[PDB]
Amino acid sequence: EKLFTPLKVGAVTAPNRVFMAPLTRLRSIEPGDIPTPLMGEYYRQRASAGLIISEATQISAQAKGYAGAPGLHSPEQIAAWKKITAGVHAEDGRIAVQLWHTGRISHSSIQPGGQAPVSASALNANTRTSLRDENGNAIRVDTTTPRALELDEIPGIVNDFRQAVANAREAGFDLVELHSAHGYLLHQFLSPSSNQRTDQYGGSVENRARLVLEVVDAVCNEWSADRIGIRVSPIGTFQNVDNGPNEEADALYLIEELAKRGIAYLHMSETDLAGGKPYSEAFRQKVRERFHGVIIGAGAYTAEKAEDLIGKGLIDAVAFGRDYIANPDLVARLQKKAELNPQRPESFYGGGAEGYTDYPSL
Numbered sequence: 047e048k049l050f051t052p053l054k055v056g057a058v059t060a061p062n063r064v065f066m067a068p069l070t071r072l073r074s075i076e077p078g079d080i081p082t083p084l085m086g087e088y089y090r091q092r093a094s095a096g097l098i099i100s101e102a103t104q105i106s107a108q109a110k111g112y113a114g115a116p117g118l119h120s121p122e123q124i125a126a127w128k129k130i131t132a133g134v135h136a137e138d139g140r141i142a143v144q145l146w147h148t149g150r151i152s153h154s155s156i157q158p159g160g161q162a163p164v165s166a167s168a169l170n171a172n173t174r175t176s177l178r179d180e181n182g183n184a185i186r187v188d189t190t191t192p193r194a195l196e197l198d199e200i201p202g203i204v205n206d207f208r209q210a211v212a213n214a215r216e217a218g219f220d221l222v223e224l225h226s227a228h229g230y231l232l233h234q235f236l237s238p239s240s241n242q243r244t245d246q247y248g249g250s251v252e253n254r255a256r257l258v259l260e261v262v263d264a265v266c267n268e269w270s271a272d273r274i275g276i277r278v279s280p281i282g283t284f285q286n287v288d289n290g291p292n293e294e295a296d297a298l299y300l301i302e303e304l305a306k307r308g309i310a311y312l313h314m315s316e317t318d319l320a321g322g323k324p325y326s327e328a329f330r331q332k333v334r335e336r337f338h339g340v341i342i343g344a345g346a347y348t349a350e351k352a353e354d355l356i357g358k359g360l361i362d363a364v365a366f367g368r369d370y371i372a373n374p375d376l377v378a379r380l381q382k383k384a385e386l387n388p389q390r391p392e393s394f395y396g397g398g399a400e401g402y403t404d405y406p407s408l
């Protein structure tokens with residue numbers, strides 16, 4: 047077993063390879079989309095993780111797509127996150143903030159001015175997002191048809207990612223993870239199914255990957271390459287957004303480009319929660335030879351699958367999502383081969399302490 051051995055991830059060193067995947071829990075304070083003391087406790091309980099990747103966090107108010115999701119834009123949010131990272135560090139843990147712009151996966155009622163959300167093209171995601179009712183309870187709602195950005199708006203998007211990263215550094219995060227997966231803004235440009243642009247940000251894969259690569263360069267220039275991670279879901283269909291008829295080739299192109307920046311890590315979300323086709327060991331090898339940094343695998347990993355792939359040298363770490371939701375001390379449990387607490391899906395989104403901080407440790 048090598049799942050419990052140290053691993054250098056960019057500027058930091060994780061004592062084990064059991065990572066906590068980014069998990070949207072929608073328990074932030076509104077107004078302000080502010081992280082809470084309860085959230086700090088939740089993250090503190092899970093500090094033994096090799097690395098904690100936070101719930102998706104807004105790089106701007108416009109980036110908001112879910113009620114209850116935190117932001118990292120505004121004095122109050124920065125101050126709130128500072129206490130959370132301090133708590134994790136007090137337990138000697140490491141935490142990375144996942145930054146996103148939901149793009150078309152949003153609703154007008156939570157956008158600035160109540161206006162239509164933005165995207166690569168004006169195509170409704172044909173899905174739903176999570177809002178809050180009159181009592182603050184989480185509820186589902188169809189996504190609002192988006193507005194195609196506009197050429198001169200792109201620089202502003204890259205700037206928002208850069209500023210959020212600057213705030214992240216100030217906030218005490220050890221690393222940042224760009225969310226270019228699961229059909230959110232960056233993925234919306236990457237995919238031809240959601241990108242019908244005729245300017246230089248649409249068409250060829252090079253054009254579709256232009257925005258994400260501009261963000262990587264910008265955040266890398268703002269902080270440091272060894273502080274930047276990125277999550278992608280380039281194979282399969284995620285939240286109604288597929289990856290095109292040449293997804294494999296297009297994925298390898300993107301990874302070679304990311305590699306040139308020498309960033310901290312490549313986080314691959316291998317399948318949608320609804321399932322998907324498995325990654326062949328051949329493809330994993332092709333990814334392996336193209337990226338020279340840490341590679342994190344995620345999906346429906348069992349400790350056994352992780353040990354097998356890490357042992358084949360195809361990946362370096364594994365991010366567990368749901369098991370981490372139900373087991374703050376997942377590291378200890380997996381190492382001791384103990385039983386895990388059962389999961390309570392009903393309380394994954396919204397609410398309070400129940401189903402959040404009440405999962406006991408051994």
Ligand SMILES: Cc1cc2nc3c(=O)[nH]c(=O)nc-3n(C[C@H](O)[C@H](O)[C@H](O)COP(=O)(O)O)c2cc1C
Pocket residue numbers: 067068069070071100101102144225227228277315319344345346347365366367368369394395
């Ligand atoms: C409650 C819930 C919320 C999630 N929120 C996020 C998130 O904020 N960002 C992200 O990239 N993926 C998110 N995911 C995906 C997880 O990080 C993870 O990849 C997924 O749960 C599959 O892994 P698992 O089988 O180990 O849980 C979410 C999944 C769940 C069930």
